[PDB]
Structure 1
Amino acid sequence: SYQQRLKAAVHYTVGCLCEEVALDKAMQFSKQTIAAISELTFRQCENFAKDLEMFARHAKRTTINTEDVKLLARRSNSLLKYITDKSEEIAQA
């Protein structure tokens, strides 16, 4: 099924990312916790997607840009900074 396939793919990457962190921090994650972060990341995409769309059309555009994405990071200074860094690095290549 289409969404199951997307979920599984998200779960796989979350698993990898968590394992990196478990190494860097010498602290393990239960299998349930990794699954929970996976569901969470999946749900979060809905919010990101919907917001991005509304932000785009608020600027009367149908195609989402990096300004829309930065807006998504607006709520935390350290996040906005990190995301702005990455966006320049992306506009570089």
Structure 2
Amino acid sequence: SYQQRLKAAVHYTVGCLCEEVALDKAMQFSKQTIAAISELTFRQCENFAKDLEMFARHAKRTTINTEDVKLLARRSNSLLKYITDKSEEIAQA
């Protein structure tokens, strides 16, 4: 099923990310916790998508750009620096 498939792909990447943190911090995650973060991340995409779409259209555009995306990360100043520094690397590519 299409969305079941996308949910499984997210769950797998989240499981990988959590395993890496778990090893780095020497702390275990329950499988229910990994599952919850997966569900959280899937829902969070809805919010990201719609926001990005509104931000592009606010600037009279139909295709989302890196400014729309940086606006999304405006919320925490640390998140802002991380997405702007990540957008400098990507630009050099």
Shorter-chain TM range is over 0.9
Deviation at 1:84, TM superposition (A): 0.2
| TM-score for both structures, normalised by structure 1 | 0.99
> What is aligned with 1:88?
88
Give the share of equivalent positions with the same residue, in percent. 100
Deviation at 1:6, TM superposition (A): 0.2
Aligned length: 93
Superposition CA RMSD, Å: 0.3
**1:26-56 deviation digits (Å, cap 9, x = unpaired):** 0000000000000000000000000000000
Deviation at 1:21, TM superposition (A): 0.2
Deviation at 1:10, TM superposition (A): 0.1
Task: Give distance in 2, aligned partners of 1:62 and 1:32.
Answer: 38
SS for the counterpart of 1:61 is coil
Structure 2: runs of 5 or more not aligned? none
* Shift >4 Å, 4+ stretches: none
Task: Give distance in 1, aligned partners of 2:91 and 2:63.
Answer: 17
Structure 1: runs of 5 or more not aligned? none
| TM-score for both structures, normalised by structure 2 | 0.99
> What is aligned with 1:45?
45
